[PDB]
Symmetry: C3
Subunit: 109 residues, 3 copies
């Protein structure tokens, strides 16, 4: 099992969701985040960040047989070719549980 974590432009969320649904992946968790990457105001000694780049973090747990296709689908849907498109990170999941049923691992996803 893998956790696919994507940081994308907020306006690409619906396209990414659609691409994942077409793969049979409809369960995902979305977080609002602030990005720093490629305005500040100096107040009482230090530089203070006064503007931020909004991004969306998409997290989806998927099987080892699914993860490569999921990464590909997110990359293709979230791409603009312009700066700030974001990143996809894949991490290993050791164990999973479906809270409603107690089902575990692949059967929980």
């Amino acid at each position: 099992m893998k956790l696919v974590m994507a940081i994308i432009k907020p306006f690409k969320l619906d396209e990414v969701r659609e691409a994942l649904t077409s793969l049979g992946i409809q369960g995902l968790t979305v977080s609002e985040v602030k990005g720093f990457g490629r305005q500040t105001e100096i107040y009482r000694g230090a530089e203070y960040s006064v503007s931020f780049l909004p991004k969306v973090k998409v997290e989806v747990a998927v099987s080892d047989d699914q993860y490569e296709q999921v990464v590909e689908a997110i990359q293709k849907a979230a791409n603009t070719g312009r700066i700030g498109d974001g990143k996809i990170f894949v991490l290993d999941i050791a164990q999973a549980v479906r809270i409603r049923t107690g089902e575990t691992n692949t059967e929980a996803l």
Copy 2:
């Protein structure tokens, strides 16, 4: 060390916290998230998500000796038996640091 990540119904957060406290686990980090799983409006070409399912993400770093009990306690407390109860994912933590002291690994948790 393990990172236990649970996505739960917001109204179950206090019950989950209480269950973890009873185990001697009081340190945890909570994020507000949006869930997609088991309303849209069509505007200028595409389907736009106009409603979301609020969920809470609970993240707690725990020792290898603790994680199984923690997963069990969260599952039991967050369960309703109804759709949308959520998921628990366990991931491996390679290293941990307590910022205040520089303590590492188990002694940081």
Copy 3:
């Protein structure tokens, strides 16, 4: 590759960003979170959390050659020596992709 996840006091975010920039790390993702660690109101049977400790979660993907220095820089910048300074967790990243280009792994970071 490693994902360095730090939970810090919100007023330390700019100092942490500056320390990371000095290392040549400018890409990071920040989340607003609620902390529980070291007020409640009883309503209709149960204890309800009515106050929360705001924290910031900093997530930065870095190379195996960089991660130790990154952990050190965050710890030093975020430290006050007072309760609540927070935690740093390091997790393994299996794969990474830059959405704009399709670049992978170290070249994506």
